[PDB]
Design a protein around this ligand. Structure first.
Ligand SMILES: *NCCc1c[nH]c2ccc(O)cc12
Ligand SMILES: [Zn+2]
Ligand SMILES: [Zn+2]
Lengths: 75, 12
């Protein structure tokens, strides 16, 4: 299908929503996740290049959305 | 930017 997953949010035995980072394709093991202002989903900090919590007031976009804004030639 | 640390099982 045109979707690897229906949503990057699964459910565990506890029924809790386990987030799946659309970057490395790994779930949240209780680490600091960053939510894109575009995707809104929760991505892992190391995979996106984050080492701590930045000002929430400041807008931030994941390597996909931040790229879709800057734009590449076409490679 | 929305950030959250669910490391409630860590001392830091
Ligand atoms: N949440 C603040 C401290 C902590 C715990 N586990 C982490 C992984 C990566 C990172 O940048 C901070 C952090
Ligand atoms: Zn990740
Ligand atoms: Zn994004």
């Amino acid at each position: 299908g045109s979707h690897m997953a229906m949503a990057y949010v699964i459910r565990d035995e506890w029924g809790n929503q386990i987030w799946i980072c659309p970057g490395c394709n790994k779930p949240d093991d209780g680490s600091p996740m960053i939510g894109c202002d575009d995707c809104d989903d929760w991505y892992h900090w190391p995979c996106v290049g984050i080492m701590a919590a930045p000002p929430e007031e400041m807008q931030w976009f994941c390597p996909k959305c931040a790229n879709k804004i800057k734009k590449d030639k076409k490679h | 930017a929305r950030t959250k640390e669910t490391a409630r099982k860590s001392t830091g």
